[PDB]
Amino acid sequence: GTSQWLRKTVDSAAVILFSKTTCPYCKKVKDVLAEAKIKHATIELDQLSNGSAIQKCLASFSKIETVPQMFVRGKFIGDSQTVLKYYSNDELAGIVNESKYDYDLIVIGGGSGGLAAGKEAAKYGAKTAVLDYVEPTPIGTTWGLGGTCVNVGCIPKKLMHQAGLLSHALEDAEHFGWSLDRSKISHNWSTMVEGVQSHIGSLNWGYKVALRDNQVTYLNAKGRLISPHEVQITDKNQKVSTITGNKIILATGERPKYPEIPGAVEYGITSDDLFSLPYFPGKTLVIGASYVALECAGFLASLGGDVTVMVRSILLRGFDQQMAEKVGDYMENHGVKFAKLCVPDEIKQLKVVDTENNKPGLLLVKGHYTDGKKFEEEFETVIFAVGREPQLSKVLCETVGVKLDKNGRVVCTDDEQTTVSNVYAIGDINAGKPQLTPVAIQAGRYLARRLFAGATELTDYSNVATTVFTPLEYGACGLSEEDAIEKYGDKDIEVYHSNFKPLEWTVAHREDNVCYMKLVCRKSDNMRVLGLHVLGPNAGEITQGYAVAIKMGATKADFDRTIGIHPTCSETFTTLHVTKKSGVSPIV
Amino acid sequence: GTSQWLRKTVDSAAVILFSKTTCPYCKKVKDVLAEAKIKHATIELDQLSNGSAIQKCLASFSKIETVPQMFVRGKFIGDSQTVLKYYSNDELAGIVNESKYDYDLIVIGGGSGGLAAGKEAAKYGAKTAVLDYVEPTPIGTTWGLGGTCVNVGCIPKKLMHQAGLLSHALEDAEHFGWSLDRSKISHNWSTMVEGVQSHIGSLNWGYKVALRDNQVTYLNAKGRLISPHEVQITDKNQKVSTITGNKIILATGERPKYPEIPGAVEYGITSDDLFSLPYFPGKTLVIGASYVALECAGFLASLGGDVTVMVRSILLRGFDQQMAEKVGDYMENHGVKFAKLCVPDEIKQLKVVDTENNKPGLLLVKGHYTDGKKFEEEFETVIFAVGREPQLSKVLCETVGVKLDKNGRVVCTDDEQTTVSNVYAIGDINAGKPQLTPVAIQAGRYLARRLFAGATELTDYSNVATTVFTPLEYGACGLSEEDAIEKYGDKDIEVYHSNFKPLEWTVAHREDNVCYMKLVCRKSDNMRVLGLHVLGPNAGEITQGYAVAIKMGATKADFDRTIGIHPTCSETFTTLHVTKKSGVSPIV
Ligand SMILES: Cc1cc2nc3c(=O)[nH]c(=O)nc-3n(C[C@H](O)[C@H](O)[C@H](O)COP(=O)(O)OP(=O)(O)OC[C@H]3O[C@@H](n4cnc5c(N)ncnc54)[C@H](O)[C@@H]3O)c2cc1C
Ligand SMILES: Cc1cc2nc3c(=O)[nH]c(=O)nc-3n(C[C@H](O)[C@H](O)[C@H](O)COP(=O)(O)OP(=O)(O)OC[C@H]3O[C@@H](n4cnc5c(N)ncnc54)[C@H](O)[C@@H]3O)c2cc1C
Ligand SMILES: Nc1cccc2nsnc12
Ligand SMILES: Nc1cccc2nsnc12
Ligand SMILES: [Ca+2]
Ligand SMILES: [Ca+2]
């Protein structure tokens, strides 16, 4: 197995140095390369269990078993002497720059995963190009470098969430003694958007600067893979050209879906438009029930908006449905209206958006409930959050041979490789993976290390924790209760649960027995924690640390013998004792 | 070893039933006892690895090997038949109530640990009495049932912390778009104290109700242990009497120390007085540098007070000193003044406290710096936070034989047993243990299970996580960096660290590169995480979950292969890569 790994490492690395820590000639090579600003991977064989066997198999490539050994793009360059020879003769730059391709790596997509991968690859000497282009939304919205999370996802989403949370902080401030009349305080949408967009701009810029500092080429151009190693780029000026790369990383992400009803594209918006909307949405209808729909509905309501969510069937399909209902119940009790069991039929325009005064238009939404009653109501803004989809036909020529699944996502091995061996896919377009920013980052960085630094560490996609930033946040790690029962049988599942009340909520006169947490455990596996679920403030901060313990195979006993930090919400996980089987009430 | 455990279990349990799940006569006994409202412990032998050997050793007590077997206070009562005989003959109440002592358990101290222990003991049929008395502070401050945390510690402390945090929420609200002028908002101390004291009152009451519902006798009387089994109680009316108990739990906690300088007792206050103070402290001097001192100084400043902390030498002695300095630096940059290397010499009174208008007095504090310069400044309130101490001479007659250490704390075995075999100590008075509310609760509950339900689980006092609720919170679990280097040598310690910025702080224009986290790891033990440290918002929520993973022996690799939740502060722990050895800057 070692021989197989070395052959792949040598073929793939752009510039790699085989060396040892306790080695003088190696350090001489290292310091030379550093002075010439030649980045490279390094593998200290003395720090590997199979080092000596690798040092021996190396001779199959270099005809020698000594260190240091320096390779460039699959070719042995030389020992200490031959490198200094190339250096003193000022032939070294041309040697390390010699390639069949323009780049060692072309990243198509400048998002969470693509930027992470490209940055990490350049760290090890890979000549890297990052392509990013943002196809405007139907109304013309566009944005800068960074992807969905940075521009029209997590970042603006959580900042607007924060602005909504401050609403309740303003309410709580009175009970804690602050001379404040919440009822005389209003929110200015455009002031918030200005600050949100200023921060996004600082990220767009920080990314450009980061790529320049790491000698990464950034091209604001639409990329199209026409052969395994050839990418066709169209720039702002419609100019077409071709660049070649050894490895290709597809990281193009997804975009929001629209329902196929009249008026939807013309008069509605999506999350892509919401976070830079130059006017307050006003009375808003959110169509959909995903975490995007509920998060957006949630903070609009907390900002004082008249918000309605049109729900076709259930909330947060794919999430623990007990928790989903508690999420929705909280929102419905805190200003969010729900048109349940209802779908839209058409969007009719009543007022055009006022560009000059920054005011929304006005729309008539027609729909129908399952009970046959008609839905007809006026809204100033209609937001569709009915899923997202890849658009790889715009990126992949069918002739290249990259296998897509029925949903249009890329079918990959557990090392992100597509059916074209030099082409990989990371992030949301990777079929079957959790569609989250830290997953894409870890996938891209770990892939870059395997390609160009000889690493073997794969990304672990199991038990990836999540948090839905609804008005009351919901964090989760592992299986939902229903999936655990499905997988192992009701008799083999024990569920410990408890309501709780944040100490912060007491003086503030907020609700008993609404915040809630549960551990879904497997009786036959020493009460292994299969899933953790918490509804309450700062649920992301609560949940994160437990994800490490679950990764390690935490049991209920592991939670119990850990001591709580008091007063916190998270400590309740260390004293859970009421089981669902017992029928005892979880209230406190 | 089994025989030893059974002998202790039988001797100690008040009412215990040996049984099996798949047993008909057992359920008959259970249902009888339930109807008669006789609480008891139960041990299903079919759910123990050593069950059959226990069922056999049982005959050494009962002369039989069958189930069910019912014991009362060390005496076999009978099988199914003999119980129903006692029941039908209405002799069963007198049997289970038969004892040499008035109580199976007398808890001296109605605090975190004592109430937890007493409640859990009654759950298994132990006739329990909880004694609580609150010796007034020098100025006459007193409070109700619950202990230090409930009345004059964590609970009011964190609520006032929350009131201080709301100050910055009010500041942040503007940048997030809220039509709010922070500069025109003031804080009303007495309104906050009213709400804080209302919540404490609901806890005082909830505890009384809980003890009544569990048939626990609550005595508001000063307890004094005069012999192993005899407690002398003095009530409000100075009436003296004696009650006897089989097991005794000492849970009397500590009280604040005063420095031996003129004016300190007469004119200063402590935390015991702060949280019900009927007047705003005004310009305040906090003398001390513990987490109490900094927490109290912190929230007073955030409420707009003119606050000074007089620090003799370093901050937070016993905590990681890198983190302590970052804590202090943040406070000094956010309105807290520090009189460094300074001690007090005397407190002179300039104004008496105004009882009628609720206004503080006025004090002249005289002291001196290490450089010889005199300290002389006027303060309206002077708070001493210079440590806490037990007062067991007021509780333990020297003749009983309970060994105390030099500091006056009880020297205990790892099962909380004192040098008097029926007397145990939990909580802050237990020498050498972390002085925290969840430790006392876990100790008391687990002890109660060992005494009266045959449990063997001990409390694990290692790697207990902490959080200091200073204006910028500091959570920690495990070793400080300096202690790890002391214990294993600098060469065997790797420290990964990073600054970070909460997303919430970006639009709010708060500080880059102030929040900070580090993992202190042991190179030779697979990079085992010896200590985790985080300075930032919600640090208690962040830290808790990682305490489980550290309990399980988390390595750095365990943190790395876990995926982050984005956007959170806690996710930064899953991507740490800068080491201290590397000299690379931790900034972002
Ligand atoms: C409202 C919303 C909120 C979200 N909140 C969270 C959250 O809180 N936490 C979390 O973990 N995840 C969240 N997500 C998901 C997160 O944004 C994605 O998982 C993440 O962006 C995926 O990164 P990626 O690299 O796979 O794709 P992307 O980030 O979308 O990057 C793809 C980039 O490639 C561009 N591109 C497309 N085609 C081409 C082409 N031919 N040539 C060049 N460039 C091209 C795209 O325009 C884009 O710029 C949210 C998503 C949405 C819509
Ligand atoms: C300002 C302050 C803030 C704190 N914040 C935190 C925090 O955030 N998180 C945390 O985990 N810990 C915190 N602590 C520590 C926490 O309060 C203690 O660890 C906890 O109270 C210990 O519980 P205990 O049972 O050992 O003692 P206690 O809670 O103090 O209970 C002892 C009870 O017994 C009474 N008593 C004494 N003598 C007698 C007698 N002869 N007869 C009858 N009754 C008697 C006492 O008056 C008292 O009511 C804080 C402490 C202080 C002073
Ligand atoms: N529990 C709930 C609240 C609001 C809308 C819903 N659709 S399904 N379940 C719901
Ligand atoms: N870093 C610090 C800030 C304020 C007071 C201090 N005493 S010691 N170190 C300190
Ligand atoms: Ca616990
Ligand atoms: Ca990670």
Interface touch B545/A540, C-beta < 8 Å? no
- B188 near B303, Cβ under 8 Å? no
CA-closest residue to ligand 1 atom 3: A153
Ligand 3 neighbours by CB, cut-off 6 Å: A 311, 314-315, 325, 328-329, 332, 338, 340
Distance CA A67, CA A18 (A): 6
Checking DSSP bridges between strand B528-535 and strand B474-478, what pairing results, if any?
A: antiparallel
Residue B172 tokens, joined = 């942040």
Query: Whose CA is closest to A85, among A153, A18, A28, A163?
Result: A28
Ligand that comes closest to the CA of residue A308: 3
Distance CA A134, CA B473 (A): 40
Q: Which of B21, B162, B194, B203 to mutate to test the interface with A (most CBs of A within 10 A)?
A: B162
Q: List beta partners, residue A425.
A: A250
Asked if A380 and A411 sit in the same domain, the reply is no
- Domain termination residue (choose one: A462, A477, A508): A462
The 8-class DSSP code of residue A137 comes to P
CA of A417 to the centre of ligand 6 (A): 20
DSSP-assigned states of every residue in B135-154:
PPPTT-----TTHHHHHHSH
This structure's resolution (Å) is 2.2
Helix (H, G, I), strand (E, B) or coil at A108: strand
- Residue in the block written with tokens 């830079």: A276
Q: Which residues of A touch B189 (CB under 8 A)?
A: 177
Phi, psi of A155 (to 5 degrees): -60, -65
> Is cis: bond before B567, omega within 30 of 0?
yes
Ligand 4 neighbours by CB, cut-off 6 Å: B 311, 314-315, 325, 328-329, 332, 338, 340
Asked if A247 and A396 sit in the same domain, the reply is yes
Residue B196 tokens, joined = 């804080």
Any ligand 2 atom below 6 A from CB of B114: yes
- Domain termination residue (choose one: A335, A369, A386): A386
First to last CA, chain A: 57
Q: Which residues of A touch B467 (CB under 8 A)?
A: 565, 568
- B302 near A177, Cβ under 8 Å? no
Helix (H, G, I), strand (E, B) or coil at A588: coil
The helix or strand, by DSSP H or E, that contains position A529, with its residue range, turns out to be: strand A528-535
CA atoms within 13 A on the CB side of A94: 5
CA of A442 to the centre of ligand 6 (A): 6
- B489 near B579, Cβ under 8 Å? no
Mark residue B478 as left, alpha or beta (left: phi above 0; alpha: psi -120 to 50; beta: remaining).
left
Interface touch B163/A180, C-beta < 8 Å? no
Asked if B89 and B133 sit in the same domain, the reply is no
- A108 near A391, Cβ under 8 Å? no
Count CB neighbours of B242 within 10 A. Answer: 12
Q: Which residues of A touch B181 (CB under 8 A)?
A: none
Asked if A424 and A334 sit in the same domain, the reply is no
- Residue in the block written with tokens 């000193």: B321
Any ligand 1 atom below 6 A from CB of A147: yes
**Best residue among B130, B132, B148 to mutate for probing ligand 2, ranked by most atoms within 8 Å of CB:** B148
Q: What is the largest CA-CA distance in chain B?
A: 85
- A536 near A472, Cβ under 8 Å? yes
Interface touch A176/B199, C-beta < 8 Å? no
Distance CA B104, CA B119 (A): 13
Distance CA A375, CA B67 (A): 66
Residue B457 tokens, joined = 């689980």
The domain containing residue B300 runs over which residues?
A: 257-386
Q: What is the largest CA-CA distance in chain A?
A: 85
The 8-class DSSP code of residue B275 comes to T
Asked if B406 and B470 sit in the same domain, the reply is no
Query: Whose CA is closest to A158, among A186, A200, A188, A187?
Result: A200
Checking DSSP bridges between strand B15-19 and strand A284-287, what pairing results, if any?
A: unpaired
CA of A560 to the centre of ligand 5 (A): 4
- A308 near A379, Cβ under 8 Å? yes
Interface touch A565/B547, C-beta < 8 Å? yes
Distance (Å) of CA B200 to CA B203, B205, B328: 5, 9, 30
- B455 near B13, Cβ under 8 Å? no
Query: Whose CA is closest to A281, among A298, A306, A259?
Result: A306
A417 Cβ contact partners less than 8 Å away, ≥ 6 residues apart: A423, A424
Distance CA A552, CA A162 (A): 32
> Is cis: bond before B256, omega within 30 of 0?
no
Distance CA A56, CA A64 (A): 8
B258 Cβ contact partners less than 8 Å away, ≥ 6 residues apart: B264, B265, B268, B270, B384, B386
DSSP-assigned states of every residue in B312-376:
SS-SSTTS-HHHHHHHHHHHHTTTEEEEESEEEEEEEEEE--BTTTTB--EEEEEEEETTS-EEE
Quick one: CA dihedral B389, B391, B393, B396, positive or negative?
negative
Distance CA A380, CA A351 (A): 8
- B176 near A163, Cβ under 8 Å? yes
Distance CA B551, CA B473 (A): 22
C-alpha distance from A68 to closest chain B C-alpha (Å): 22
Phi, psi of B105 (to 5 degrees): -145, 130
CA-closest residue to ligand 2 atom 47: B134
Residue B573 tokens, joined = 């722990």
The residues of A annotated as belonging to the active site are 566
CA of A435 to the centre of ligand 6 (A): 15
Query: Whose CA is closest to A438, among A116, A134, A130?
Result: A116
Distance CA B70, CA B82 (A): 10
Distance CA A449, CA A257 (A): 34
Residue B461 tokens, joined = 């006092």
Asked if A369 and A242 sit in the same domain, the reply is no
Distance CA A420, CA A412 (A): 10
Asked if A69 and A161 sit in the same domain, the reply is no
C-alpha distance from B418 to closest chain A C-alpha (Å): 23
Q: Based on the number of CB atoms within 10 Å of its own CB, is B345 exposed (0-12), middle (13-18) or buried (19 or more)?
A: middle
> Is cis: bond before A68, omega within 30 of 0?
yes
The 8-class DSSP code of residue A567 comes to S
C-alpha distance from A249 to closest chain B C-alpha (Å): 21
- B447 near B416, Cβ under 8 Å? yes
CA of B165 to the centre of ligand 4 (A): 22
**Best residue among A294, A311, A337, A472 to mutate for probing ligand 3, ranked by most atoms within 8 Å of CB:** A311
Distance CA A228, CA A250 (A): 12
CA-closest residue to ligand 2 atom 53: B153
Distance (Å) of CA A319 to CA A28, A444, A467, A482, A543: 56, 26, 11, 9, 15
**Closest ligand 3 atom to Cα of A341:** 7
Q: Which residues of B touch A563 (CB under 8 A)?
A: 434, 436, 438-439, 442, 460, 464-465, 547
First to last CA, chain B: 57
Phi, psi of A165 (to 5 degrees): -60, -35
How many residues are given for chain B? 588
Q: Which residues of B touch A507 (CB under 8 A)?
A: 159, 162, 192, 195-196, 198-199
- A465 near A472, Cβ under 8 Å? no
Asked if A421 and A289 sit in the same domain, the reply is no
The residues of B annotated as belonging to the active site are 566
| Single-letter residue type at B29 | V
CA angle B13, B16, B19 (to 5 degrees): 145
Rg (CA), chain B: 27
Mark residue A523 as left, alpha or beta (left: phi above 0; alpha: psi -120 to 50; beta: remaining).
alpha
Helix (H, G, I), strand (E, B) or coil at A526: coil
Q: What's B118-129 look like in SS3? A: HHHHHCCCCCEE
Asked if B483 and B442 sit in the same domain, the reply is no
The minimal CB distance from A564 to the residues B180, B438, B558 is found for: B438
A509 Cβ contact partners less than 8 Å away, ≥ 6 residues apart: A175
Domain count, chain A: 4
Distance (Å) of CA B438 to CA A107, B403, B446: 50, 25, 12
Checking DSSP bridges between strand A128-131 and strand A103-108, what pairing results, if any?
A: parallel
Distance CA A286, CA B307 (A): 49
CA angle A81, A85, A87 (to 5 degrees): 115
- Domain termination residue (choose one: A336, A352, A386): A386
Q: List beta partners, residue B354.
A: B359
C-alpha distance from A50 to closest chain B C-alpha (Å): 17
Distance (Å) of CA A421 to CA A246, A402, B69, B570: 10, 9, 70, 36
- Residue in the block written with tokens 């947490």: A517
Distance CA B541, CA B514 (A): 19
Ligand that comes closest to the CA of residue A321: 3
CA of A438 to the centre of ligand 3 (A): 29
Checking DSSP bridges between strand B15-19 and strand B69-72, what pairing results, if any?
A: antiparallel
CA of A316 to the centre of ligand 3 (A): 10
The coordinates were experimentally obtained by X-ray
Interface touch A159/B506, C-beta < 8 Å? yes
Q: Which residues of B touch A465 (CB under 8 A)?
A: 562-563, 565
- B114 near B130, Cβ under 8 Å? yes
Residue A76 tokens, joined = 């042995």
Query: Whose CA is closest to A519, among A483, A547, A494?
Result: A494
Helix (H, G, I), strand (E, B) or coil at A442: helix
Residue A135 tokens, joined = 């196809």
Query: Whose CA is closest to A227, among A41, A35, A422, A75?
Result: A422
Q: Which residues of A touch B543 (CB under 8 A)?
A: 545, 565
Helix (H, G, I), strand (E, B) or coil at A284: strand
Q: Which of B449, B542, B565, B588 to mutate to test the interface with A (most CBs of A within 10 A)?
A: B565
The minimal CB distance from A186 to the residues B179, B466, B507 is found for: B179
Query: In degrees to the nearest 10, what's the CA dihedral of A192, A175, B150, A572?
Result: -40
Residue B357 tokens, joined = 């208008």
Interface touch A562/B571, C-beta < 8 Å? no
Distance CA B583, CA B588 (A): 15
Quick one: CA dihedral B26, B30, B32, B38, positive or negative?
positive
The helix or strand, by DSSP H or E, that contains position B207, with its residue range, turns out to be: helix B189-213
Any ligand 2 atom below 6 A from CB of B133: yes
Any ligand 2 atom below 6 A from CB of B435: yes
A152 Cβ contact partners less than 8 Å away, ≥ 6 residues apart: A143, A271, A272, A274, A275, A276
Asked if A296 and A248 sit in the same domain, the reply is no
- A327 near A419, Cβ under 8 Å? no
Query: Whose CA is closest to A69, among A104, A105, A45?
Result: A45
The 8-class DSSP code of residue A216 comes to -
Q: Based on the number of CB atoms within 10 Å of its own CB, is B58 exposed (0-12), middle (13-18) or buried (19 or more)?
A: buried
Asked if B308 and B359 sit in the same domain, the reply is yes
Checking DSSP bridges between strand B15-19 and strand B41-44, what pairing results, if any?
A: parallel
Distance CA B140, CA B120 (A): 33
Count CB neighbours of A23 within 10 A. Answer: 18
Query: Whose CA is closest to A262, among A352, A153, A382, A370?
Result: A382
The 8-class DSSP code of residue B543 comes to H
CA of B436 to the centre of ligand 2 (A): 9
- B515 near B536, Cβ under 8 Å? yes
Mark residue B130 as left, alpha or beta (left: phi above 0; alpha: psi -120 to 50; beta: remaining).
beta
- Residue in the block written with tokens 């929350």: B162
Distance (Å) of CA A428 to CA B46, B248, B436, B571: 50, 61, 45, 20
C-alpha distance from B199 to closest chain A C-alpha (Å): 7
Q: List beta partners, residue B386.
A: none
| Single-letter residue type at A254 | E
Ligand that comes closest to the CA of residue A337: 3
Distance CA A293, CA A271 (A): 9
Distance CA A323, CA A514 (A): 11
How many residues are given for chain A? 588
**Closest ligand 1 atom to Cα of B564:** 11
Residue A130 tokens, joined = 């990052």
Ligand that comes closest to the CA of residue A559: 5
The 8-class DSSP code of residue A204 comes to H
Phi, psi of B425 (to 5 degrees): -135, 135
Distance CA B585, CA B588 (A): 9
B194-218: burial string, b at 16+ Cβ within 10 Å, e else: ebbbebbeebbeebbeebeeeebbb
Distance CA B341, CA B370 (A): 6
Helix (H, G, I), strand (E, B) or coil at A378: strand
Interface touch B544/A542, C-beta < 8 Å? yes
Ligand that comes closest to the CA of residue B116: 2
| Single-letter residue type at B344 | P
- A315 near A323, Cβ under 8 Å? no
C-alpha distance from B244 to closest chain A C-alpha (Å): 32
Asked if B378 and B395 sit in the same domain, the reply is no
Query: In degrees to the nearest 10, what's the CA dihedral of A172, A174, A179, A182?
Result: 70
Query: Whose CA is closest to A157, among A307, A298, A312?
Result: A298
Distance CA A527, CA A553 (A): 10
Strands (E), A188-304: 217-219, 222-227, 230-234, 240-250, 254-256, 284-287
Distance CA B261, CA B345 (A): 6
Count CB neighbours of A462 within 10 A. Answer: 10
Q: What's A60-89 look like in SS3? A: HHHCCCCCCEEEECCEEEECHHHHHHHHHC
